[PDB]
Structure 1
């Protein structure tokens, strides 16, 4: 009386940010978002549901996770057990090939992989669309890691209509790269979930964010259709700066940036000034991601090595959607 399943999902980095939930229970977002799934960082997860288990168990990077660290996995397991009428405790064994809780989207790859493993184990036979909807319930960004390359999370207006899909770009995504500047791989002070809730509920800047996101998304789409790299980069750099601006208007205000974040951002502007087209974005933490055409990646890593070590510059290319495995 045992059901098991496995999946691999890659991280994604948001080009147009998701920031703030319209519905906290179902993770319905205030705005639509768009990301690039990457090849460098991924999560591998197996789940086992077994009548003989006596409690839910979460093992991450070979390390048993404590009650606080398991609360959310347990929330996702409860949700999927209701969606199957399954009453069995589960064992979740996951390995993050990506720093955890550091602004490098380990919740995207991690909850996507768990959703996929659960889909397999409980024989749910979900379409990609419906697997995206389930992953959304664990972490918003995870619903986009179901797909490769460019993916859009349509905010919709209900559990049924909020989900992601691939954005065809006539192969453009394979002509691009993202260079991670690792300022700090440690666990961050304010979680993505808590930070965006504080922003929604208290930031005087949040309406400004909302009033600009759809225009940014439209221009990202026009840029894709024309493979206009400077236009893409200007939109996404400003979109990320606008998102981080919102936390300075929260009550109390806060920032995800660290000193090295600003150093890296300024350096990206120097690189542009000195003839390397590239644009930075930051998800919810201190690390800096630099969008750059593949042909300029080595140029950029060398430029940036003047201030960061080899261990701090990690390149990445477009990556695949989720991979399921019956075991």
Structure 2
């Protein structure tokens, strides 16, 4: 009496940020977002539901995860089980294909992969849209990893209308790259879920954030239509900076930046001034991702080696949507 399934899902990085929930229980977002799915970084996950299991078990890179480390996994299992009316404990075994000690965020690829594996195990037979909705409920950013290339998460107004979709771009995503700059001098960081909640509830800058998301999204779409990279880059760099601005107005205020983050951001500006078109973005942590055209990627990598070891500079390209496998 067992049911099992497997999936592989790639990470995505938001160019227009999701920051703050309109509904915390269903992870309905206050604003729509837009991401690029990447090839380099991904998660492979198997799940087994078995009547003979005695508790939920989560293994990550071969290491048994403790209660706190399993929290998003455990909550997703309960909600997928309630949706299937399944009463069995599960075993989740996941492997993250990210660079050693990089400290990448893996909730997007991990919960997306877990959602795909559960869809297979429990025979839910979900469409891509409904698979995105399911993964949304484990982690908002996971719903975009269902899709490859550019994807948009439409905020919607309901569990039924909040989900992601691919954005066709005439293969423009295949001309682009993202160079990760790995920064480790970071303080202990508020989780994305807790930080965005504190920002929604207390930041005097959050209305300014909301008032600007939709125009940024429209201009990303216009830029994609004309393959206008400097225009894309200027929009997404300011969007990310605006997102981080909101945490300095929270109560108490906080920042995700480390000293190295600022050095990296300053160097991106110098690279642009030397004529290398490239634009930075940060999520809920100190790493700095640099959006650049493929033709300019080695120039950018060379320039940045003056201050960062080669271990600290990891390129990624456009990647595919989720893949499901039977066991």
TM-score of the aligned structures, taking structure 1 as reference length: 0.98
Aligned counterparts, 1:197-276, within 5 A: 197-276=197-276
In 1, distance between residues paired with 2:102 and 2:132?
A: 23
Distance 2:36 2:72 in 1: 25
Q: Within 2, Cα distance between the matches of 1:98 and 1:186?
A: 19
Contact map agreement 2:59 2:65 (CA 8 A) in 1: yes
Corresponding position of 1:89: 89
> How many angstroms does 1:204 deviate by?
0.3
Deviation for aligned residue 1:71: 2.2
Q: Which whole-Å deviations, capped at 9, do the CAs of 1:185-209 have from their partners, x for residues lacking one?
A: 9895210100100000000000000
- Measured after TM superposition, the shift of residue 97 of structure 1 is 1.5
Kindly indicate whether the alpha-carbon contact (under 8 Å) linking 1:103 and 1:188 is maintained by their aligned counterparts in 2.
no
- Measure how far apart 1:40 and its partner are: 0.7
**1:82-132 CA deviation, whole Å, 9 max, x = no partner?**
110000000000011226997733100000000000000000000000000
The answer to whether the 8 A contact 1:111-1:135 is kept is yes
Report the counterpart of residue 49 of structure 2 in structure 1: 49
The one-character-per-residue Cα deviations of 1:15-34 (angstroms, maximum 9, x if unpaired) are 00000000000000000000
Tell me how far 1:254 sits from its aligned partner.
0.3
Q: Deviations over 1:211-230 (max 9, x none)?
A: 00000000000000000000
Any conservation in 2 of the 1:43–1:97 contact (CA below 8 Å)? yes
Flag the 1:325–1:185 CA change in 2: closer, same or farther, 3 A: farther
Moved over 6 A (4+): 99-103
Give the Cα separation in 2 of the matches to 1:56 and 1:282.
Answer: 33
Paired residues of 1:102 and 1:285 also in contact (CA < 8 A) = no
SS in 2 for 1:145: helix
CA distance in 1, matches of 2:225, 2:15: 16
Q: Distance in 2 between matches of 1:215 and 1:285?
A: 25
**C-alpha separation in 1, matches of 2:75 and 2:222:** 39
- Indicate conservation of the 8 Å contact 2:185/2:258, yes or no: no
Contact map agreement 1:280 1:288 (CA 8 A) in 2: yes
Superposed CA RMSD: 1.4
Residue by residue over 1:134-182, the C-alpha shift from the partner in whole angstroms, topping out at 9 and shown as x without a partner, is: 0000000000000000000000000000000000000000000000000
CA apart distance, 1:67: 1.4
- Change in Cα spacing, 1:244 to 1:186, as seen in structure 2 (3 Å) is closer
Aligned residue pairs, count? 327
Residue 55 of structure 1: SS of its match in structure 2? coil
Report the CA distance shift for 1:103/1:243 in structure 2 as closer, same or farther (over 3 A): farther
The aligned residue for residue 150 of structure 2 is 150
Cα distance, 1:174–1:187 mapped onto 2, change above 3 Å = farther
Is 1:104 matched with 2:101? no
Does the C-alpha gap of structure 1 residues 163 and 111 become closer, same or farther in structure 2, counting only changes over 3 Å? same
Say if 2:187 and 2:258, in contact at 8 Å, map to a contact too. Answer: no
Q: Which moved more, 1:65-74 or 1:264-273?
A: 65-74
Give the Å deviation of 1:48: 0.1
Provide structure 1 residue ranges, at least 5 long, that are not aligned to the other structure.
Answer: none
TM alignment of 1:71-220, pairs within 5 A? 71-98=71-98, 104-184=104-184, 188-220=188-220
Distance 1:83 1:187, change over 3 A: farther
In structure 1, what is the Cα distance between the partners aligned to 2:64 and 2:186? 19
